[PDB]
Amino acid sequence: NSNICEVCNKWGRLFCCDTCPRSFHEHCHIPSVEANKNPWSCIFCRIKTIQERCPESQSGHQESEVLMRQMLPEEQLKCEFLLLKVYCDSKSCFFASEPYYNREGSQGPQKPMWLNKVKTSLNEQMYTRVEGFVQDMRLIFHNHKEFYREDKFTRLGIQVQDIFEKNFRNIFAIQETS
């Protein structure tokens, strides 16, 4: 097994996957690492199994169809993994916890949003369709762009949104386009 957490790249109290060499902090894994279960298989492994059990699941899909999917177990997992892929980027730190807004010339967003809120909402099964999760994720970056205006800090939202979108297209096998 690796000696650092796959998500945050730090050592510490790590839980090791039984079917691959990755390791995790308890609350870095999504869902949080399960109490018992020997062997234990990480989210990366669980996602790989879905693809292996249904190879045709990798054929191209339309985003509009993906968004309307109900949050059955496999879609729940895919959103958990997409969320985790964002937290894998160190720039996710800026979007993790509850923001506050007091900048001359800007007004805060009407609906603030942040990663840990999305994480809780997934854990509490508050999304009934993939669309709910994706909307909240895109809202994080849209709020940031609007608030920061011409400050160069706006670029951090563009950057982390790009990680989200690339991973969304990979995990849900969105049809490639020009």
- For residue 128, the minimal CB distance to Zn ion (Å) is 25
Task: Identify whether the C-beta of residue 178 lies closer than 8 Å to the C-beta of residue 64.
Answer: no
> In whole angstroms, what is the distance from residue 44 CA to residue 71 CA?
19
> In whole angstroms, what is the distance from residue 9 CA to residue 51 CA?
26
Q: What is the dihedral of CA 49, 50, 52, 57, to 10 degrees?
A: -160
In 3-state terms the chain splits into helix, strand, coil percentages (rounded to 5) of 50, 5, 45
| Residue of 4, 16, 20, 139 interacting with Zn ion (CB under 5 A) | 20
Choices 19-27, 59-67, 78-86, 159-167 (CB under 5 A): range interacting with Zn ion: 19-27
Q: Verify binding: residue 158, Zn ion, rule CB under 5 A.
A: no
Site string for Zn ion, 23-52 (x = CB under 5 A): --x--x-------------x-xx-------
- For residue 53, the minimal CB distance to Zn ion (Å) is 6
The binding site for Zn ion (CB under 5 A) comprises: 5, 7-8, 17, 20, 25, 28, 42, 44-45, 54
